[PDB]
Amino acid sequence: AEVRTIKVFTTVDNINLHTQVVDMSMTYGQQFGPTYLDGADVTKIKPHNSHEGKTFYVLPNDDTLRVEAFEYYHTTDPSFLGRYMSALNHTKKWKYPQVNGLTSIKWADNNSYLATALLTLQQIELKFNPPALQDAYYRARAGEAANFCALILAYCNKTVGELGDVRETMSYLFQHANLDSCKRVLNVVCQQQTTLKGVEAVMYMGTLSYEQFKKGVQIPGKQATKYLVQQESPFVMMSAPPAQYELKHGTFTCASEYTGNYQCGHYKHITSKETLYCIDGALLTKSSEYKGPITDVFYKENSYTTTI
Ligand SMILES: O=C(Nc1cccc2ccccc12)c1cccnc1
Ligand SMILES: [Cl-]
Ligand SMILES: [Cl-]
Numbered sequence: 001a002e003v004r005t006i007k008v009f010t011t012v013d014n015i016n017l018h019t020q021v022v023d024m025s026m027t028y029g030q031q032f033g034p035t036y037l038d039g040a041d042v043t044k045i046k047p048h049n050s051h052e053g054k055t056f057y058v059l060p061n062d063d064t065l066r067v068e069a070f071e072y073y074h075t076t077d078p079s080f081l082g083r084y085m086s087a088l089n090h091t092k093k094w095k096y097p098q099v100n101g102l103t104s105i106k107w108a109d110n111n112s113y114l115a116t117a118l119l120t121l122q123q124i125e126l127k128f129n130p131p132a133l134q135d136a137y138y139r140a141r142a143g144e145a146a147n148f149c150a151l152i153l154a155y156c157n158k159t160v161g162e163l164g165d166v167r168e169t170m171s172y173l174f175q176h177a178n179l180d181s182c183k184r185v186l187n188v189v190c191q192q193q194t195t196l197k198g199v200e201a202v203m204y205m206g207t208l209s210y211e212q213f214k215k216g217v218q219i220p221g222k223q224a225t226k227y228l229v230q231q232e233s234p235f236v237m238m239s240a241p242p243a244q245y246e247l248k249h250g251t252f253t254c255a256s257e258y259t260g261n262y263q264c265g266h267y268k269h270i271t272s273k274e275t276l277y278c279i280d281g282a283l284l285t286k287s288s289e290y291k292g293p294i295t296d297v298f299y300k301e302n303s304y305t306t307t308i
């Protein structure tokens, strides 16, 4: 016969390249195991002349690739890279319009939760620990958000099409961020002080109102009053089961609204600027106040000490 070869590069992080000489009579799968080209699964495809010099993603199946993969992604989940490529093959087809100066996402594949989460990140002070999220988030800020969206889906174990919860998505992103400074001190009355650190310092479930949190809130044999003693964080995220709630200009940073039923609904994003903007993927509307089924509100913070 004839024995044709081309040079290609393999990678796990798209920075460190590994020279390979491949045989054009055999599948990528036969030579590398699972192989991807900008998200497309090429496992079962033979190399084409047009592939010469291109970078393919492979699985971290030896020690060089494992160390590179862990240093870049901070995960040893063996399905991670497959899940990332699968998502990226869809997210690179989404549109990321600039809406009121923020990178949003045009509705597709039930992605409203991601669009609100992405708009929220652009309004709060947060730095990611994995280089993969640092690099993708920098590009997402500049308007090329496909990698960042595909990484969020991979790190949160969501496939394209699956509706997620904004609070849970933010929770997972927060676990991969530098929130070590963050500290909350609470008191309860039936006294009992507690101290929360990192992610648990910036999140509360039960009330949307930061004001109401500082004054105190009823909770579980009769009732008890919980209130905010001290807060050290650049923001706080107040969450509750979706319920009609009134948002007013200048009283909050941003918020997520959830309409519809369990596992069949739609998020919109409200931002407080010169007035209230409702951002619904590519869609933009304004009002002086906003009433809706709110589930999350974000507030700016630095340092707070009670006067109780
Ligand atoms: O119920 C939801 N979110 C939640 C909000 C508040 C409290 C919750 C408690 C348990 C489960 C989901 C909750 C939900 C459902 C479908 C899509 N997105 C979100
Ligand atoms: Cl996917
Ligand atoms: Cl949706």
Ligand SMILES: [Cl-]
Pocket: 126, 127, 128, 133, 134, 137
């Ligand atoms: Cl970052």
Ligand SMILES: [Cl-]
Pocket: 074, 129, 130, 175, 176, 177
């Ligand atoms: Cl991390």
Ligand SMILES: [Zn+2]
Pocket: 190, 221, 222
């Ligand atoms: Zn009691």
